[PDB]
Amino acid sequence: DLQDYKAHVIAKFDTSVDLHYDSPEMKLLSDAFKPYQKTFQPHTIILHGRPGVGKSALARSIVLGWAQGKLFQKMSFVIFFSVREIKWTEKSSLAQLIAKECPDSWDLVTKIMSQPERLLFVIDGLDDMDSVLQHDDMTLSRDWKDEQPIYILMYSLLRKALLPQSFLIITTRNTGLEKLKSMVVSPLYILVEGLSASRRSQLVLENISNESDRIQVFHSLIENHQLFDQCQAPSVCSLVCEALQLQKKLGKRCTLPCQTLTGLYATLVFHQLTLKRPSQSALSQEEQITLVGLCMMAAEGVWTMRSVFYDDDLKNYSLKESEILALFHMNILLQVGHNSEQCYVFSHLSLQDFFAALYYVLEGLEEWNQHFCFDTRLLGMKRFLFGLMNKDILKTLEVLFEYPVIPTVEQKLQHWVSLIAQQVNGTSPMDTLDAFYCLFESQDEEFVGGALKRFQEVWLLINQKMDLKVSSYCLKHCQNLKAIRVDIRDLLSVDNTLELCPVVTVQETQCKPLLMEWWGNFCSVLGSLRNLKELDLGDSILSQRAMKILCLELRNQSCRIQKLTFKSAEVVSGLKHLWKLLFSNQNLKYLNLGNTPMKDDDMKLACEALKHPKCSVETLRLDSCELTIIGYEMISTLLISTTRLKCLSLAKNRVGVKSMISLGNALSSSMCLLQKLILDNCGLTPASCHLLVSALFSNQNLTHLCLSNNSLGTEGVQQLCQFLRNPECALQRLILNHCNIVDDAYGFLAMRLANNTKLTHLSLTMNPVGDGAMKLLCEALKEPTCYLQELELVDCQLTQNCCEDLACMITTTKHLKSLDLGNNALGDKGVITLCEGLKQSSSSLRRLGLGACKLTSNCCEALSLAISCNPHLNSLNLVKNDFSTSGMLKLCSAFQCPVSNLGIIGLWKQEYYARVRRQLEEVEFVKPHVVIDGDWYASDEDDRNWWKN
Amino acid sequence: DPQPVWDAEPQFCQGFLIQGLWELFMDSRQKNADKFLKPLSWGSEVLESSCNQPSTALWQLERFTVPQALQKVRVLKHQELLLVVAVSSFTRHVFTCSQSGIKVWNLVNQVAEDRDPESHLKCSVQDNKVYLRTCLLSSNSRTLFAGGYNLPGVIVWDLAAPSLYEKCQLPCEGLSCQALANTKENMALAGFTDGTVRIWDLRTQEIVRNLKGPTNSARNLVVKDDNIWTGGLDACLRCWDLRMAKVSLEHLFQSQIMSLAHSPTEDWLLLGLANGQHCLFNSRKRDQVLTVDTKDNTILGLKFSPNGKWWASVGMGNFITVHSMPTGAKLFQVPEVGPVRCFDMTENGRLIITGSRDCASVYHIKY
Amino acid sequence: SLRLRTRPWWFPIQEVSNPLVLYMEAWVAERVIGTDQAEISEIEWMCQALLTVDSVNSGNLAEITIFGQPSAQTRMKNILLNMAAWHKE
Numbered sequence A: 001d002l003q004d005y006k007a008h009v010i011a012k013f014d015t016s017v018d019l020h021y022d023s024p025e026m027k028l029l030s031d032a033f034k035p036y037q038k039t040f041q042p043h044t045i046i047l048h049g050r051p052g053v054g055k056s057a058l059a060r061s062i063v064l065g066w067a068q069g070k071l072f073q074k075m076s077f078v079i080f081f082s083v084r085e086i087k088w089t090e091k092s093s094l095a096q097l098i099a100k101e102c103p104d105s106w107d108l109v110t111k112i113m114s115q116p117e118r119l120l121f122v123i124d125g126l127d128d129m130d131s132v133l134q135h136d137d138m139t140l141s142r143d144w145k146d147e148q149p150i151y152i153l154m155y156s157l158l159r160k161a162l163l164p165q166s167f168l169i170i171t172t173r174n175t176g177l178e179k180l181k182s183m184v185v186s187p188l189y190i191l192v193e194g195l196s197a198s199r200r201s202q203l204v205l206e207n208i209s210n211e212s213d214r215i216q217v218f219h220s221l222i223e224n225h226q227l228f229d230q231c232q233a234p235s236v237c238s239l240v241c242e243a244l245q246l247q248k249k250l251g252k253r254c255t256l257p258c259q260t261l262t263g264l265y266a267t268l269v270f271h272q273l274t275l276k277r278p279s280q281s282a283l284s285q286e287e288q289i290t291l292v293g294l295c296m297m298a299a300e301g302v303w304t305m306r307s308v309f310y311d312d313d314l315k316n317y318s319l320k321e322s323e324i325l326a327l328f329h330m331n332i333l334l335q336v337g338h339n340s341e342q343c344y345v346f347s348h349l350s351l352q353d354f355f356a357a358l359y360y361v362l363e364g365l366e367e368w369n370q371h372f373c374f375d376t377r378l379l380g381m382k383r384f385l386f387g388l389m390n391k392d393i394l395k396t397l398e399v400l401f402e403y404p405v406i407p408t409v410e411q412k413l414q415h416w417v418s419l420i421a422q423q424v425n426g427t428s429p430m431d432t433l434d435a436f437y438c439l440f441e442s443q444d445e446e447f448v449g450g451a452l453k454r455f456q457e458v459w460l461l462i463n464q465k466m467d468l469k470v471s472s473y474c475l476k477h478c479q480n481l482k483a484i485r486v487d488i489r490d491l492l493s494v495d496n497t498l499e500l501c502p503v504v505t506v507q508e509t510q511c512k513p514l515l516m517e518w519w520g521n522f523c524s525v526l527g528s529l530r531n532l533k534e535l536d537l538g539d540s541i542l543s544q545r546a547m548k549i550l551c552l553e554l555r556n557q558s559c560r561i562q563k564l565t566f567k568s569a570e571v572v573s574g575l576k577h578l579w580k581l582l583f584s585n586q587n588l589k590y591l592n593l594g595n596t597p598m599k600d601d602d603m604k605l606a607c608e609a610l611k612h613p614k615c616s617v618e619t620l621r622l623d624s625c626e627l628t629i630i631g632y633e634m635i636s637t638l639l640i641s642t643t644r645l646k647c648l649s650l651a652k653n654r655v656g657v658k659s660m661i662s663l664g665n666a667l668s669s670s671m672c673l674l675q676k677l678i679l680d681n682c683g684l685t686p687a688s689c690h691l692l693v694s695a696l697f698s699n700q701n702l703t704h705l706c707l708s709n710n711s712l713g714t715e716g717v718q719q720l721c722q723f724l725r726n727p728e729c730a731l732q733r734l735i736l737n738h739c740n741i742v743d744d745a746y747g748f749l750a751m752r753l754a755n756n757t758k759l760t761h762l763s764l765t766m767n768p769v770g771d772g773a774m775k776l777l778c779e780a781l782k783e784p785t786c787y788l789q790e791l792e793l794v795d796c797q798l799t800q801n802c803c804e805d806l807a808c809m810i811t812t813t814k815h816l817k818s819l820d821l822g823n824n825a826l827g828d829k830g831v832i833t834l835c836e837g838l839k840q841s842s843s844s845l846r847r848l849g850l851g852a853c854k855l856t857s858n859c860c861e862a863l864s865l866a867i868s869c870n871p872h873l874n875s876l877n878l879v880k881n882d883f884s885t886s887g888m889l890k891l892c893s894a895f896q897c898p899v900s901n902l903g904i905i906g907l908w909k910q911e912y913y914a915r916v917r918r919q920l921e922e923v924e925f926v927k928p929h930v931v932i933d934g935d936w937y938a939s940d941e942d943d944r945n946w947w948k949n
Numbered sequence B: 001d002p003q004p005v006w007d008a009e010p011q012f013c014q015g016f017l018i019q020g021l022w023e024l025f026m027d028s029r030q031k032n033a034d035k036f037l038k039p040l041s042w043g044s045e046v047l048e049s050s051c052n053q054p055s056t057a058l059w060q061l062e063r064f065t066v067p068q069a070l071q072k073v074r075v076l077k078h079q080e081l082l083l084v085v086a087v088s089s090f091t092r093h094v095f096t097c098s099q100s101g102i103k104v105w106n107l108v109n110q111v112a113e114d115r116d117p118e119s120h121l122k123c124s125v126q127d128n129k130v131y132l133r134t135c136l137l138s139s140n141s142r143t144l145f146a147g148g149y150n151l152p153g154v155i156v157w158d159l160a161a162p163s164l165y166e167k168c169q170l171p172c173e174g175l176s177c178q179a180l181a182n183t184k185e186n187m188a189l190a191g192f193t194d195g196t197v198r199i200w201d202l203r204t205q206e207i208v209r210n211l212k213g214p215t216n217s218a219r220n221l222v223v224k225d226d227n228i229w230t231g232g233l234d235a236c237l238r239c240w241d242l243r244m245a246k247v248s249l250e251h252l253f254q255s256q257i258m259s260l261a262h263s264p265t266e267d268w269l270l271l272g273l274a275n276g277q278h279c280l281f282n283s284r285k286r287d288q289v290l291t292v293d294t295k296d297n298t299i300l301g302l303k304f305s306p307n308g309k310w311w312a313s314v315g316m317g318n319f320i321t322v323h324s325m326p327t328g329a330k331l332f333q334v335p336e337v338g339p340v341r342c343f344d345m346t347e348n349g350r351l352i353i354t355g356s357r358d359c360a361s362v363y364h365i366k367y
Numbered sequence C: 001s002l003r004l005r006t007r008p009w010w011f012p013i014q015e016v017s018n019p020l021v022l023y024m025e026a027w028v029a030e031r032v033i034g035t036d037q038a039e040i041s042e043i044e045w046m047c048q049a050l051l052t053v054d055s056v057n058s059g060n061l062a063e064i065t066i067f068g069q070p071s072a073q074t075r076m077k078n079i080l081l082n083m084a085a086w087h088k089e
Helices: A002-012 A026-032 A055-066 A094-101 A106-114 A150-158 A197-207 A214-223 A225-230 A234-249 A261-276 A285-304 A311-316 A321-328 A349-362 A376-387 A391-401 A409-421 A429-441 A445-451 A465-475 A514-528 A544-554 A572-582 A600-610 A629-640 A657-668 A686-696 A714-725 A744-754 A771-782 A800-812 A827-838 A860-868 A885-895 A914-926 B013-028 C026-032 C038-047 C070-088
Strands: A044-049 A078-082 A120-124 A167-171 A188-193 A334-336 A343-345 A458-461 A484-487 A534-536 A563-565 A619-621 A647-649 A676-678 A704-706 A733-735 A761-763 A790-792 A847-849 A875-877 A904-906 B069-077 B084-086 B093-098 B101-106 B119-121 B132-137 B143-148 B155-158 B166-168 B187-191 B196-201 B207-212 B220-223 B227-231 B236-241 B246-252 B257-262 B268-273 B278-282 B290-293 B299-304 B310-315 B319-324 B330-335 B342-345 B351-355 B359-366 C003-007 C020-025 C050-054 C061-067
Touching: A002 A055, A026 A055, A026 A188, A044 A055, A055 A078, A055 A120, A055 A167, A078 A094, A094 A106, A094 A150, A120 A150, A150 A167, A197 A214, A197 A234, A197 C061, A214 A225, A214 A465, A234 A261, A261 A321, A261 A349, A261 A376, A261 A391, A285 A311, A285 A321, A285 A349, A285 A376, A285 B013, A349 A376, A349 A391, A376 A409, A376 A429, A409 A429, A409 A445, A409 B013, A429 A445, A429 A458, A429 A465, A429 B013, A458 A465, A465 A514, A514 A544, A544 A572, A572 A600, A600 A629, A629 A657, A657 A686, A686 A714, A714 A744, A744 A771, A771 A800, A800 A827, A827 A860, A860 A885, A885 A914, B069 B330, B084 B132, B084 B342, B084 B351, B093 B132, B093 B359, B101 B132, B187 B220, B220 B257, B227 B257, B257 B299, B268 B299, B299 B342, B310 B342, C003 C050, C020 C026, C020 C070, C026 C061, C026 C070, C038 C050, C038 C070, C061 C070
Parallel strands: A044 A167, A044 A188, A078 A120, A120 A167, A458 A484, A484 A534, A534 A563, A619 A647, A647 A676, A676 A704, A704 A733, A733 A761, A761 A790, A847 A875, A875 A904
Antiparallel strands: A188 C003, A334 A343, B069 B359, B084 B093, B093 B101, B101 B119, B132 B143, B143 B155, B155 B166, B187 B196, B196 B207, B220 B227, B227 B236, B236 B246, B257 B268, B268 B278, B278 B290, B299 B310, B310 B319, B319 B330, B342 B351, B351 B359, C020 C061, C050 C061
C-alpha cells in the first residue's frame, strides 16, 4: 500500500514548481547522511536560520522529492510533522499521530518490525515548544502505544529513547536553540541563508527616491547590520521596498523618518488605518479595544515565548478574526492549520515585536482592563521601543486616539542611559556603544539631548563605519564631555583600496571613498566640541591620508584640545602633518610622543617647529624614541635657544658620554629655562652621573629632578650634597628609587637634611637602608630645622628594631605629613610599639602606609585604640595582611567611632566572611564620605606621579 | 559557622533594563549609585584599567607581573558533586566533570547564572554502574581524555571536528584511573590505583611500557621532557627515566603527598602535604627540600602561573590562597562555602575557575 | 535565493549575525581559495573564523563573507589579502 501513500503525499505537497529542483545546494543535504569520517555517521540534522527564509518549504521539498526519486532511496518511509498546527496539551500516543498522518493504519504494524533502521522523521517547527517543558523533571517514554501528552512524546523522540537507530531532521530557528542543544546527541548543523548582499543592495537601490538625499539615506540603510541582516527574507525586503515607494508618493504629507526599520513600519501600519477612515478622523471606541487587545496579546506572547495563539487565547482578550481583518485590510495574523482547532500567527515576527513594543505606549491612556476577561529574544522589541520615541509618530497616535500621548517608559529609558554614564572606575565601552546605537534609532534631539548629560568621560572602540556615524551623531549632544579615547585598530591601516560593490558604481561620480568622508565628518565633530580638552588615540593604527585629515581638522580655530597622546599608536607616516599642526593650533600645550622612533629629518623638523614663535607646547615627553648623536646635538641647540618648554623627559634610551657632555653644557648655561627633567632607565654610569651633577652645579632653574633606576656612586651622592649645599639651588623634589646608595651616603644625606629648606619631597624606595641609617635619618628629622614633607621607604630593608625611633620621630616631628612603609617586616611587636606613639596624635601626620607589613590578628586591639582617637589621620593602607574575624570586627568598630575622620581606606572587601561584609556596609552607610577601595595609590591630592605619566 | 552569604555578583546594566521592563507589565495588568560589573566581552577580555604602582619596573622587567585581587563574574550550575574543571582559552570553552558525566559550556554567553550546557557527555548508560574520576585537556585544545572506576578504558574525544563524538578507547580494563597526563611525543600515560603507570601510543592505541610501584603511590603524576614524577600515600617521591625505565630518585617526607606541580620556566617542583605544609624541590640539583608555609587543613590543589612567578592553592579550609614564588608569602584570600576540590587557569593569565559543591565559579584576575 | 553551509559545533551561534564583506577580482579567488577543502578548514580552525566565497556575479568581481569576532575577522582578512598580493605578483 506504499504506492497509494506516495501518491497521496504527492497530491498533498505540490505548491512549488519553479522553486523545487535538483539544485547544487540539495546534494549536500542528500549526502549529509553519509560518514564524513569512516568512524562517524551522523543521525540528526538541525536546520537553523532566520525566521523568514524558506526552511519549511525546504522540508516540504525534501518530503516531495523522496516521493518521486533522486532524493532518498535507502529511507523506506518519510513522515512529515508540523507541530505549529497542532495542540500539544492533549494525551495521545505516537501510533495515533502516524495514523492521522498516514491514511492506512494496517501498514504500521508490519512497518515497526523492520523499519526502525531504515526510517526518517521530518519535524517542522519545534520552536514554539520551548515553553511547554516544566524544566523540573520530564518522564521519559520508552515505547509507543502509551497515553501521554504529546510534548513528552517529542521529548522522548529527541533523546533517542523512544525509537532509536532512526534518522531525524529538525527545522528550527536560531534563537530557539538554547534548550535543544543539550537534549540531542551529537547533531550536525546546517546554516540556511537568504538572498545575497549584492542582490539586496540593488533591490534597495532601485526604490530609493533620489531627490538630493539618495546617497546618505542609502548608506544609512545598507550599513546598519540590524536591518540589513534581517532583510534576508524576501518578505522583509518586499516590505522595505513597498514602504520606500509609499513614502515617495506620499511626499509632503508624510513626516516620519526613513533611515530606520521603525520609521518604515509605522509608515505602512498607520497609513493602512487611514484608508479605512472616510475622512481624517479618530478611531472608534470598539476599534481602540481591538487594537489594544492585539498589542497586549503580542506582548504577552513575547514575554511567555509563544507564537501560535490558539482560539482560547483569542477569547481571553475578546478578539475576533473578522474584526481584525476588517480593521486593517492588511496581512496581519494569518490563520494556519487544517483540523477543527485553529491557530493564528503573525505574518512576520517583526510585526509581533512592533506590536509588543507599541503596547507600552497605549497602556496608560485609560482603564483597559475592564473589557478583558483574563535575553536575545527581546532585542527587537527593545529596539522598536527605543525607536517609537520619535515625536512624529506620537503626533499620529494622538490624532488617532484623541488624547495627548506621553508614555511612562521614556523616563525609565533615560534613567537607564544615565546610569551608564556615572560609574566609579570608568565606563565600559560596549555599553556606551549599545546606548549610542539605541539612541540613534530615535531621530529626536530632545530625547537624545536629555539622555546624555552626565558622561564627562567616554571610551570608544570603532571597527565599523556605522560606529563612526552613530558616534558622530550622538557626540554632538554630549555638551559636558571633557575627555575621550578612541581605539581604531584596523579600519584605517591601509592607505589605498579602490573597489566598487555592484557591477557598476553605485554613484556615477564619487571621486572619494565613503570611509574617508565619514572619517572627516567624525574628525570635524571632534574639532567642534567646546569643553573637550583631552584626546587619546589609544591603540590606533593610522596611514598617511587619515593622519593628514585628522591634522587638518584639528588645525581649526574652534578646537581647544590641550593634551595629545600617541604613546600606543603607530603614526610614523603622518609626522610631517603633525609638525605643521604643531605651530598652528595655539591651544596645545602637552604632547606625548612615546614609543615612536624618530629619524634625523623628523627630529630636525620637530626642533624647527618648536623654535617657532607660534608654538605653545610646554611639556614634551620623548621616551623610547631611539635617538642619535646628532639628535642629542639638536636637542641641546633647542634647549639653549628660545622656547616655551618647561618639562622634558628622555626616559628609556641610552645616553653616551659625548651626548652627556653636550647636554651638560646646555644645562649649565644661564640661557636654559627648564623646570622638570626625567632621566630614569637611561644609560647613566657613576662617571656620567658625576659629570652631570658637576655641570648642574651652576644651574639655578631646575626644581624637579628624577634619577630613578640608575647607578649612583658615593662620589655622586657627595656631589649631589655639594650641589644642594650652596644657596639659590631651587631644587624641590628628588627621586632616587633604585640607584644603589649604601653606607656613608646615608650619613651625607642626614647631614644635609639636618638643616635645609626648599627640599620638601624625597623618595628612597628599593634601597638597602637598614636600622643603622634609619637612626641617623630619624635623628635628622627630629630637629626643628627640617622642612621635609614626604618620605617614601616602601621596599627598604626594615625591621622592628627601629620602631621606637619611628614613634619618637612621629611624636616630635612638626613638618612631616606622609610616611610610606611598603614591604618592611615590622611584625606585631613593632606595630604595637609604633601605635604607642601614634595613639597620642602629637603631630600632624595625615597619611600612613602599612601595606604588606606582615600583620596578624594580635595587634588589632592596639591598632583599633590608636585609630579610635586620632582625628588627624585621613588615609590608611591595610592590604596584604592577615586579619581574623574578631580582629576585623574590632577594626570595623573602631571605624564606626564618631571621632575618626578617615577618608580613604585601602581594603579588598571580598576576602572576609558575611558578618565582616555587613559591618563594612554599615560603616559605609554611617559615614558617606569614606571610600573603601584596594587601589590605594590611585588617589593623588598633590602632584605625586609627575615622573610616571 | 562562618557562613558566607551569596549575592547576585554581576548585576549588569543590560539585565537591569530587562528586569525593570518586566515588572511594568504585571504592574499594568493588575487591576483586571547602583554598581554594575564589567561584562566579559566576546568571552575573551574585560576591558578595564590596571592598578597603579609606587614605582616603575626595570626595562628588562616587562612581562613579570603579579595579581592583586579576584572578581567573580559567573556561576555554572552543574547539578552534582563537582570533581574536575578545565578552561580552554583559545576556543573559549569550559569542562566540568562529576561522577555521572561531563558538561561543556561556552564563555560567549552573557548571563549572570548559566544553567544550559552546550552538551552533556555521559557514559553511564553503556555499562551497569560506572563512575568517573578525572578528565584532561590537551595543550592545543584538540583532544579530551576521561577515566573512571568501572570503565573498560579511557575515552578520547575529538574537539576539532564539525561534530562531537567518541574517537578511541586506550584499553585498561581492571583498574581505576586516578591520574592522567599527556606529553609532546604523542603518547598518553595514566597512573592507576595499584601503583601501575601505563603508557599508550595515542595514534596506534598500543601499550608501550608499564611501570610498577607500591600501592597508592601513583595518585599524583607529573611529566617533563624525559622524566616522570609520582607520589601518593606511601609518603615517598620517586622519579622514573623513560630511557632506562627504572627509578632514579627516592625521597622521604613526614606526611602523605596530595598534589604536585612544576614551573613552566624555572626548574622547581611544588609539593602539598597532608598537614598543610608546602615544599619546594629543585628538579635539576635535587639537593634538599625546603618548607615555605604551613596551614591547618590539608591541600588538594596546586598550580603555577604561566610566567612562573606565583601559585594558588585550594583545600578543605573554606579558602583559596595565592602565594609569591621567591619566598612563598601569602598575597590574598577568597572564601567559599565548602571544601574546594578543583580549579584551573587559562594560558593568558586572565581567568580562574573553581568548583566547591556543585557549582563552578569563574573569577577575573586583576593585575 | 538559498545557500547552505555546515557550521562546526565549536562556532558560537552569537557570532553568525555580523559578517564582513569585501570585493576582489574573480580571477584571483579560484587560485587563492583553491580547490581542496582541508586546507581551508585548517585555516578556519587556526584563525577561529569562517569564510565563504561566492562568484555567481556576472562581473569579474567576487564576494567574500567572513564570520567571527573582530580580531579573528581582521587576521583572516590580512591572510587572504597577503595571499592575493603574492599570487598577483
